[model samples]
Target chain A: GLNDFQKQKIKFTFDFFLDMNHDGSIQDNDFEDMMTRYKEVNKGSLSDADYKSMQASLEDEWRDLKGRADINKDDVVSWEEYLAMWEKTIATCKSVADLPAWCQNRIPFLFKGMDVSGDGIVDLEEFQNYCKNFQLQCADVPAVYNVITDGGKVTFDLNRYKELYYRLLTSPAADAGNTLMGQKP
Target chain B: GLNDFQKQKIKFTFDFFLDMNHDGSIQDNDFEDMMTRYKEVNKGSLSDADYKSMQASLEDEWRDLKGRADINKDDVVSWEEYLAMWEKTIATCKSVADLPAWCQNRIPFLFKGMDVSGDGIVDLEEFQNYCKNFQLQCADVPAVYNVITDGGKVTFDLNRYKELYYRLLTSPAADAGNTLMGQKP
Candidate 1:
């Protein structure tokens, strides 16, 4: 069984991935939006065959998640279904360190979407928007920014951004309240 | 066995931890400096027993690393030794998800050191100094600042600073160069 800390991390990750459209559910359109983003990240380098294969993988994953978790068959995975699915998956794991590979890689990519300006960076407003999208408290935004920039600056590049993403996932259970998205304990 | 990706993350974490004085090596004074910082973080709240327990834990960890990894017993852990120790430890892990609990908790506290002004925010100059202290490339300072501030600001609080910290650790392998300290791949 998953502990509260592990479940919190799973919940945070699920909310991040499933709400790409910021609509609060995992739906076909959100999946399409995510696929578009994957292609954009791999632009110029991804071959047609590679893209098809990637798309197929994504489709399979989405279908499996919806099929198993979308209890009402509503064509969307609501937060409740998402939580239940993650809880079940987590039950099979020994610790938070056992997070699936896909879950591990998806975090930085999620930050990329928050880089609203498409400049490979996240600015204050962009970050604030991300907080709002996740319904997080904004008071801690500056603190989070400082953590990445190392105290006397206000901007962070993609590298710093990704660092925060990983930190959120790996932070101590006692500090779960400090997750990047301001997930409450 | 640790994959390349996992190794990279572990390397990043180890460097951040061992370079307590940001001098690129683990030394006696660095250990002392780290203990001081730890006490500072728990100031007023930590009782004598708690303080002693924390100190003992740190001492044990430092002694273990120095004894095992300092092949010459030189009382210093060079970068090579540091890497070797971690690589060996990681080889025993089932996955990156098994990162030690201490490793998970240390990052945010690391950021606290960079907040020199103690104003709960890190301004542009403070961040710049942090980079310089670590001998990181400052050429990207403006770019990083612009990204965090959304192109017009100069201060980041602890929360934001933490975001950047985790970001550096978790950025794509292709983006290791993007670490907060501006490390080269």
Candidate 2:
């Protein structure tokens, strides 16, 4: 069974995604707004057909989520509905093996926020500040840095940080040093 | 002299506006993206001319800020430049009465984020959560609530909260109870 911390991490990630507008709730307009920006970010590489496919996929995802979570069908996803959806997803993760992929998709977005300096590299200070910002305590900064760095370097590029996050979320016990991000319990 | 709390409040407000995309830095694209969204938000009420005027005004504001702060003209405004500008602005407020009107526009946006429940009102729980999120403390929740509420109600409507924020920003010592948002060091 996933422990409270694991559950909390999922909730945090889900809440972050659901509240893209930062306007307190998730609605159809928020999804459209987020998709519009997402399209802008990928405009150069996304072909017209690919862009249309992504738009359709996002709409489908939104509809599915709303179907399951919008208990009252009031066109607004409230916190309670959000929590219910999260709980349902958590139920499907019967073991740690089922967790990593579920969490990996959010790593890039989380890393962007954690890179508070916007320097494209997350250094020791940036990592520490991120932990502090979220009221988290990473017991071993150097160890976590090592996981995301190479040749004893003290900074983590985005890809490396994503790998570290994936490792942490997938195997909490094996990646115990990442307990600052969260623990199994 | 303004206290530590007052200074922090200014910094917080400045940082929020500067980092429009919440991506940790200010860049040209971020400004364009914000303007696009701003236009969308006001599209129904704004005539084409009025909308273009607002866009120009914002462009001018951005240029003015970058001109003064973008020392290297790198097209990206770093946190250093942001703080330097704030420091310069703060200097102009030699007396409490000399506070600038430019900074006042952001108080409402800040309030919206703090109103986490998405309700039109901010209650004790929302207030406490906002303080916790920012690593701040409200010495007396009741006192702060009283400032924002009327007739013993325990919530602060948006307008009331905005007025309180304005008072605190313009004359912090006079609004001592607002130290919950920030306190003098």
Candidate 3:
């Protein structure tokens, strides 16, 4: 549904925010400082009560993040962390490392299928491809098109993608809106 | 459903990440620096493409953020800048002003409401009352019970609370899932 150009544009937006210093990696400082600056802008506008509610939600998010960090044990994540998290997230959309035998087979198969280039890894493109192919399989190009183009131009907003990815990748089957359901052949 | 203690703990985590400096305000440097750190930690693990995609997302977020700043021609935001943004934001959720309209109402309402003993603006008591109320409203009691009662008594983590408040006040939509959705009246 989304052309290469559209995907590229979206990717650009994602990189800009996640890269922080434009250096290309996501580190603790990037997350910390962005929130800090955002707070400065936000505080001036929010009421104390609403602000507190926001803080609570943030706390919930951080706990999940920190839990991921804890699993890394280095107290920080490397890009490899994605692989570490991938099967659990993408295949099953769960965070639990332990899986049934079927899932173990299914994850690799699913990942490989999506990683059409066979790079031993999947990037946004691979994921998008997976979505596209899935859309075709489901005959849902219109829905896929809406997602990739945001219902208009081909340009995708990477930040929006990342936000969506975070939500989708981190969410459970029910919460993710059954989007990844029917993965089985 | 979350208890006071859990909420306090969650608040602590939110603050630690959001408040780059221990100070009450978040600035541009704080945000920029945070991104720098995030990239540093996550760089090696991510593939060049993966990193690129993520980076693009950050850019879009930042661009939108930059658009929100100093739109009125005067470079730095003064109290007047703050107030004008506040009023407009309350009148409309998506104003061209640097801050969101809801936040504009929220901040002042908080300041006034939390000035419990009401000597006009917030002092230490006002701050404490505001925080306590916020804890009741925001934290997950079970998750943060220990942090709230490390020595067998309920306690406020002032430093954490300050940090949490800063982040809470600044985020794009602290309401998370319900951010754009109208809460049932």
Candidate 4:
């Protein structure tokens, strides 16, 4: 992983986008707000039942996410609280494959929810919806998309997404990993 | 600015965001498309007549923006085309204050278009809308907003925005100027 200056910046950026209502904290509503945005993007392709399933997954994702960090029991996680938990995670877990149960669920939650039709390949609109959820600048989805795939593939499989997600947290190079944040690393 | 590694990354980031339609070129449509986003945020305060005037101003903004860079007369500016012109601009003009007419019109178009009610104060939502147009990750609005203002003030005036705009192009600091791109510089 890079030093605090870069990694913390990445994390800070994540924190803000997670806070859609801009109230300086991440509330349950923010997560629900995200679910609606996610629902809209996939509505055309996925059935309502699939969306309902994802909603339950969203709540489950939130439960684990909040339980892992919301130390004060306030139902809202502040930057200090989230970072406190994050510091512990990165200190021990160096990659996605090795992450603890709480930390590792994110990739699957995002991948299964977004890889419409369960094709196991996360495609462009799926990736774009993921970016939209975080307000990421995915304009160069073309360039970044190519970087994430090999063999001239337009989409990537689940394993690769996990690898890149892991790399996004641990590397600082201008590759698929870091560029996942939607900027040149 | 920083090294080409950083500067080009910044420019690349800008290019992708500017190419909103993902067609690899910034058409005049993209510019007008941006105006509507601009209009929506301030619609409550600004009158239809005012927006009608801005509509004209948007046309003027497009003319100068397109004419200055649309060297091939194609009416759509690609990254290559935009960069061909940007290469010359940055080769000499270094700051917002001294930008050539073609390049400099951007700030005013953005400023006048954004500073809702023309109070000269670019507030949080206006800044957020600006970020939305480019899809910059402005999650740290609170932290960045304070950095842009002073004396506990919540908003920044136009002169400061220009100074920061100039700095965004030339410096690599995590201050308000470079943070215009909404990453931690």
Which candidate leads in lDDT?
4
Candidate 4 backbone collisions, by pair = B1-B170
Candidate 3 CAPRI assessment class? incorrect
Please provide, for model 4 over B34-75, each residue's C-alpha lDDT reduced to its tens digit, 9 standing for 90 to 100: 667767677677787877876776577668768877887888
lDDT of each: 0.59, 0.56, 0.38, 0.64
Worst 10 residues of 2 chain B by lDDT: B176-185
lDDT of 1: 0.59
Those runs of model 2 whose alpha carbons end farther than 4 Å from true positions after fitting are A1-185, B1-11, B91-97, B100-145, B149-185
| Predicted model with the maximum DockQ | 4
For each candidate, the DockQ is: 0.01, 0.03, 0.01, 0.20
Identify the superior model by DockQ, candidate 2 or candidate 4. Answer: 4
Count clashing pairs, candidate 4.
Answer: 1
Q: Write model 3 residue lDDT over B25-96, tens digit each, in one string.
A: 333444455556546756676578865664454454334433554466533332233334334443443322
Deviation from native of the Cα of residue B104 in model 4, angstroms: 3.3
Task: Show model 4 residue runs off by greater than 4 Å.
Answer: A1-25, A30-53, A98-100, A112-119, A122-156, A170-176, B1-25, B34-49, B112-157, B170-176
Q: Candidate 1: RMSD over Cα atoms?
A: 20.2
lDDT over C-alpha atoms for residue B54 of model 4: 67
Superior by TM-score: candidate 2 or candidate 3: 2
Arranged by TM-score, best first: 4, 2, 1, 3
Interface RMSD for each predicted structure? 17.2, 12.9, 18.7, 5.3
lDDT of 1 by residue, B1-185 (tens): 44444444545555455665655478777768777876776687768897787667667667766777788887988766766766665455443244444444454456666677678776677767766554343334555555655556434765565555544544435342244644323
lDDT tens digits by residue: candidate 2, B1-185: 44533454544554444555655467776667756765765667668887676567557666766777788988777755665666666556543234444344344545655776678777778876775455442334444555556446535766666556555544455363353343311
Off by over 4 Å in 3: A1-28, A69-72, A94-185, B1-185
